[model samples]
Target chain A: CEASAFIVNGDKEELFLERVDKLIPTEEGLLLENIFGQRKVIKAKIKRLELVDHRILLERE
Target chain B: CEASAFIVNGDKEELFLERVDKLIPTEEGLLLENIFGQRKVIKAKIKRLELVDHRILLERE
Candidate 1:
């Protein structure tokens, strides 16, 4: 299954990206990868990792 | 004063453990324990280990 990530800005939480199968935490930022082997990196921090809903919340560092 | 671990909606934040001194990442997930030599295991990965924020974020594997 795939999960989604959101960018929480102030009181507004917006969709940053979706279908991220995995999130690799690096010193630079977050590395989001999919089954297809493609990846996206973001300069954000984990606000929360909601597994029951299969989604992730993040915010700019 | 110790760090906490949560699996949150991966719905709610569930306190997996408390007083985690150092989180040792392993093949199973993470080795969470306190300075006293207690330990617990979970099938999760690191979202971010925010020592400054004093929180531990985990995503279920």
Candidate 2:
């Protein structure tokens, strides 16, 4: 299964990504990959996860 | 399923919590609750989550 990613800005959450299967932290930043082999990197840090809500929260560095 | 929480202090990671079912950001700090009615309030922010590894990383704010 996959989950969506959001960046919590102030009190609101903005969409950061979609269909995230794996989240890897790299020296450059945070790395994300999906089951379909899509890859992405973001200069941010993870904030929290809500499995019931299927949400992954992040914050920019 | 539940996951463990860690606080990354530079290159070392210290165990912050365990059996985390939900993570919520609150005005006081980050709130964590487990299905068994366990709760924790940490003054930190989520940095990332690795489902494949069953790990949730956080950083003190």
Candidate 3:
């Protein structure tokens, strides 16, 4: 699918990605896949998850 | 605070990080802050975001 992400720390916000394949969870952390079929891992302290306007919002505590 | 991640591609899964500070969003991509306050950006195509068992899971299409 096509989506973007936002990461927040206190009042700091940054853009994530323009387009992504999907978001998955494992015993480890988060997995991100690019259109190139390549995979990336995200291991962070996330506070919340939101889906708005066809976009993904990831917040940290 | 503390967390870990996993990257998945079809049936492929890899270990990401053992611990991180937090996750942020940037116009460039996703910014990941480590416990040391260092940041790393992830520019990928993501599909879904999930939070389970205090772990953040990011999946791609």
Candidate 4:
């Protein structure tokens, strides 16, 4: 089964959604696309992604 | 019981060690002390920390 991915900011704010595609790395940062056909760009200098069970934590700076 | 912590670099290299103390936030970055009394500092612009059951994944940039 596929799990959902969560994008969390430094302030602890989170954007949780289902993963639609693999993370695309760019010159500036990463591109996150959700199953809803939505795209989110994370331009943080540093970040983390955690996979626990069925949850994915995308840490954004 | 106190679980151990792991420091993971962006290259996917990991440092699995025990936690010696709490995470200390510094002006430069975060300070991590291991059970062996070893101190590791994360000075990257972006990073991530994950706590899963008995393991902590500290992602470095």
Residue range B1-61, candidate 3, lDDT tens digits = 2445456677775655445445555567655665666556666333344322224444543
Q: What digit string (tens of lDDT, one per residue) describes model 4 on residues B1-61? A: 2234566555674655564244454676656565456776765332333222334455545
The candidate 3 chain A region of ten consecutive residues with least summed lDDT is: A45-54
- Indicate which candidate wins on lDDT: 2
i-RMS, every candidate?
A: 11.8, 3.4, 9.8, 9.8
CA lDDT, candidate 1, residue B9 = 64
lDDT by residue for model 2 over B11-31, one digit each (tens)? 899987787778877789888
C-alpha lDDT of all candidate models, in order? 0.66, 0.77, 0.50, 0.48
Per-residue CA lDDT of candidate 1, range B1-61, in tens?
2456777663467767765665555667667776466788788877654332345678788
Q: Which candidate would rank higher by TM-score, 2 or 4?
A: 2
Chain A of candidate 4 gets a TM-score of 0.52
State the C-alpha RMSD over the true interface residues for candidate 2, after superposing those residues. Answer: 3.4
The number of the candidate with the highest TM-score is: 2
Deviation (Å) of A23 in candidate 4? 0.5
**Chain A TM-score (model 2):** 0.85
- As a whole number from 0 to 100, the lDDT of residue A15 in candidate 3 is 72
Task: Show where candidate 1 strays beyond 4 Å.
Answer: B1-61
Candidate 2: stretches off by over 4 Å = A1-19, A22-31, A40-48, A52-61
